[PDB]
Ligand binder design. Structure first.
Ligand SMILES: [Zn+2]
Ligand SMILES: [Zn+2]
Lengths: 168, 6
């Protein structure tokens, strides 16, 4: 006799169970929020804890071939965005001296494209960090009511949605 | 999915 589910109880044949394909434990459908009628519609089942781990590890796993191609498509979508104009290329040292006096880790979409090309990134978190740097640098350097700051707000919102469901 | 029902 083994103990199963998050509730740690022995098997009761009068209750509905669903098996997790990742950890191989069994769960009462009632304890994990899934009814028999709903279970019929899914091929594999991943329990809540295993799913939380899978969701969290998406940004830490190795970037695959397909991931890299996907990153290129994500960059292309941002590059075509109306609010991406301040972030397409590095700030021109000649248009703006003190920009580089205070930003030592600048970032832009063209530089990110180069980094994706040469596979500088090896985990999604690294790509997301560079993207976030583009927006954080902008918000650090410009007033919140300024067009530059707000473009970062808009594009970051667009970015977050674009990245939904990115990893296989 | 793998299940156990009555
Ligand atoms: Zn249970
Ligand atoms: Zn599991």
């Amino acid at each position: 006799t083994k103990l199963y589910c998050i509730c740690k109880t022995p098997e009761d044949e009068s209750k509905f169970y669903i098996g997790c394909d990742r950890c191989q434990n069994w769960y009462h459908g009632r304890c994990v929020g899934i009814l028999q009628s709903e279970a019929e519609l899914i091929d594999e089942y991943v329990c809540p804890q295993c799913q939380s781990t899978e969701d969290a590890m998406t940004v830490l796993t190795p970037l695959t071939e397909k991931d890299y191609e996907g990153l290129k498509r994500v960059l292309r979508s941002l590059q075509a965005h109306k609010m991406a104009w301040p972030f397409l290329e590095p700030v021109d040292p000649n248009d703006a001296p003190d920009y580089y006096g205070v930003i030592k880790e600048p970032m832009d979409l063209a530089t990110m494209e180069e980094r994706v090309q040469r596979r500088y990134y090896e985990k999604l978190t690294e790509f997301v960090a560079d993207m976030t740097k583009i927006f954080d640098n902008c918000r650090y350097y410009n007033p919140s009511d300024s067009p530059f700051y707000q473009c970062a707000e808009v594009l970051e919102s667009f970015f977050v949605q674009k990245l939904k469901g990115f990893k296989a | 999915a793998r299940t156990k029902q009555t």
